[PDB]
Amino acid sequence: GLEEEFRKLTNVRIMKENMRTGNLPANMKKNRYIQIIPYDFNRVILSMKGQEYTDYINASFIDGYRQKDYFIATQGPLAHTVEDFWRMIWEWKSHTIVMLTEVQEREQDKCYQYWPTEGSVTHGEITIEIKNDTLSEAISIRDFLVTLNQPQARQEEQVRVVRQFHFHGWPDIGIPAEGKGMIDLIAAVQKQQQQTGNHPITVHCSAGAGRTGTFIALSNILERVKAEGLLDVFQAVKSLRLQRPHMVQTLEQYEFCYKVVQDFIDIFS
């Protein structure tokens, strides 16, 4: 049963023995939450330039159904990590960002706005220029021109398009009342990834655990249902809980996973 499954998920141990880098004093200011920190065995490592601790961001590579390291699960950037966030996007060649929160929800700040609503913004050596913004139901799809400005000699060849899927269909309290929004989000993300190929999909909410884990679990589960027909939810979520603390954080989110799968089967007929 669903509550017994989630009880076993809760019991998945947080493996603190492997959380050294994120717990270093100089890196702790880069975390939103003390208890959501990546494991060293899959943390996303950035280049270093001086700089002893500039290789850290609170972000984990997460396995997909067919491919290792298919997702990056990360927290919403902070004001003092926005440069690291865009450097991660560049250095690991992510072309797709999935945002599962508003920047502000119920008075509280959930995510620094790291993209330009209009025009351009520069964070560190990287310039981001919004080229298109399309709203379709509860999903804003935004295409940005992203330029690495260093070295100046290579500026012309160092331009990429990065697409952000901004999901507006998650209530400030509880879980979505329908699965269609989540199913459409996953399907649009899948269409984009056909064109880019084996590039990691960057996914974030606020801490990068609850909604983020739900989106990733459902992407993985629905792919397995399509390829094998195997109906499992527990093992897919358990695997995520072993890759990053608290992926799929609450019972209601776990319920939502089952509901979305059922809605997907119904569309599947």
Residues labelled catalytic: 205
* CA nearest to 71, candidates 56, 83, 88, 87: 88
Q: What's at 78, amino acid-wise?
A: L
**Paired strand residues for 73:** 60, 203
**129-135 long-range Cβ contacts below 8 angstroms, 24+ apart:** 131/161
What are the CA-CA distances from residue 31 to residues 51, 59, 75, 77, 170 (Å)? 18, 10, 8, 9, 23
CB of 57 closer than 8 Å to CB of 204: no
Q: Which element (helix H / strand E) includes 223?
A: helix 210-228
Give me the DSSP letters along 141-154: EEEEEEEE-SSGGG
Q: What's at 230, amino acid-wise?
A: L
**Structure-determination approach:** X-ray
Find out if CATH 3.90.190.10 is the number for domain 1-269: yes
Strand ranges for the chain from DSSP E: 43-45, 56-62, 71-74, 96-99, 104-105, 108-109, 120-123, 126-136, 139-148, 159-167, 201-204
* CA nearest to 142, candidates 122, 119, 125: 119
**Resolution in angstroms for this experimental structure?**
1.9
At 179 the three-state DSSP class reads coil
**Measured distance CA(119)–CA(160) in Å, rounded:** 16
Sequence-ordered list of residues with C-beta below 8 angstroms from that of 110, at least 6 positions apart, any chain: 76, 101, 102, 103, 104, 205, 206
CB of 157 closer than 8 Å to CB of 166: no
